[PDB]
């Protein structure tokens, strides 16, 4: 079998139309969730900083965001990752704190019974 | 140039659509211009032909002839106009088919459906 790439420009267009389709549904919030900053796990790459999967629970507790609130305002949680050093904790705590500064959370209507 | 991806410029698909068209489409494919008097009085440029329509032949050997449309032959996309015939071997008169775009409508067989059509297509009466 020989795989051909004639749909390469048609996949590019289809993926872009999905981003536009996604943005139409969720109008003002970002098309991606904020990702942490981590360091790759080798002696070849540990100097580089890249994006992680989600923020650790210890990073969210320091930033002031609970693990149940976090998912609702676009902050992924990684229950697996941990902070073995204070630099990873502070690098990503500041990342969450900056995110909260630039964030507008629209209020939600709440059911409110008469008494009690 | 056409910019819609919903319309085909393919000669294969354009010819198949025209020659395989159903009767309710050939009614629109068989349209004729109106005379200048009707065109600037009904505010309509062209209308589909119909029986009892009074037309003038504009092109062909029979150019200049006039008469009512006895019947429209939608199978072959032809009009049959009264007194526009051809003599056969035995002297019987065989009518000659004329394309609907080769005639001009000098008088309209007005009906309520066509009267509604005129006011629909920006016209007046």
């Amino acid at each position: 079998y020989v795989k051909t790439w004639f749909n390469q420009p048609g996949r590019k267009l289809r993926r872009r139309q999905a981003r536009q389709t996604k943005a139409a549904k969720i109008a003002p919030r970002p098309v991606e969730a904020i990702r942490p900053a981590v360091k790759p796990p080798t002696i070849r790459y540990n100097m580089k900083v890249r994006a992680g999967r989600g923020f650790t629970l210890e990073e969210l507790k320091a930033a002031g965001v609970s693990r149940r609130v976090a998912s609702t305002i676009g902050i992924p949680v990684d229950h697996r990752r941990r902070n073995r050093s204070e630099e990873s904790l502070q690098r990503n705590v500041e990342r969450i704190k900056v995110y909260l500064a630039h964030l507008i959370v629209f209020p939600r209507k709440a059911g409110q019974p008469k008494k009690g | 140039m056409k910019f819609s991806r919903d319309v085909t410029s393919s000669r294969r698909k354009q010819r198949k659509a025209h020659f395989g068209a159903p009767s309710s489409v050939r009614r629109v494919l068989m349209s004729a211009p109106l005379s200048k008097e009707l065109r600037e009085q009904y505010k309509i440029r062209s209308l589909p032909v119909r029986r009892d329509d009074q037309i003038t032949v504009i092109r062909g050997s029979n150019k200049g002839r006039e008469g009512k449309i006895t019947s429209v032959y939608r199978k072959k996309f032809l009009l049959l106009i009264e007194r526009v015939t051809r003599e056969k071997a035995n002297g019987a008169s065989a009518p000659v088919g004329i394309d609907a775009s080769k005639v001009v409508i000098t008088k309209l067989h007005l009906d309520k459906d066509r009267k509604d059509l005129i006011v629909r297509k920006g016209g007046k009466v």
Binding site: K25, A27, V31, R35, P107 | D6
Partner: protein
């Protein structure tokens, strides 16, 4: 060529033609009305987010960015408090203005007491005063539901207002 596709070629029945081909046209915006009004339909979502002053991605972009015109320490990270951010556009100000005003409208968080709740807390207060909530919770006769001091404190607070 297929017997099924040849069958509808040999038939007189028309195809179930559906004219849906519309490329280069982008999805129309719903959800937020403020974004919809200020969203143009020709520009991309990156161009519209930037024009409206929002961020499409809180991360890096995995490619180039268009250039249309030539350009002319844990204590201080944990105890710090970032001073929010200014609104670069009138749309962002419009979004921010709506959020604060609506939150102010929906701010009545304190709750009243029902007939049972009021009579419950009132009877406890008439015997143990208003400051001794620990002995209020330990009275099995009047505190049948066995509410602790913190629940009884919140009951009294809601009764005050």
């Amino acid at each position: 060529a297929n017997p099924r596709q040849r069958n509808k070629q040999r038939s007189g029945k028309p195809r179930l033609t559906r004219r849906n081909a519309n490329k280069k046209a982008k999805a129309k915006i719903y959800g937020n009305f403020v974004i919809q009004q200020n969203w143009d339909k020709h520009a991309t979502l990156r161009q519209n987010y930037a024009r409206l002053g929002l961020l499409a991605t809180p991360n890096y972009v995995t490619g180039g960015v268009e250039k249309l015109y030539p350009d002319p320490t844990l204590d201080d990270v944990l105890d710090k408090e970032i001073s929010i951010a200014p609104a670069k556009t009138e749309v962002v100000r419009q979004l921010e203005e709506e959020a604060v005003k609506k939150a102010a409208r929906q701010s009545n968080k304190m709750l009243p007491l029902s007939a049972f709740e009021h009579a419950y807390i009132q009877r406890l207060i008439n015997k143990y005063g208003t400051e001794d909530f620990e002995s209020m919770a330990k009275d099995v006769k009047l505190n049948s539901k066995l509410f602790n001091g913190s629940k009884l404190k919140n009951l009294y607070i809601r009764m005050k207002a």
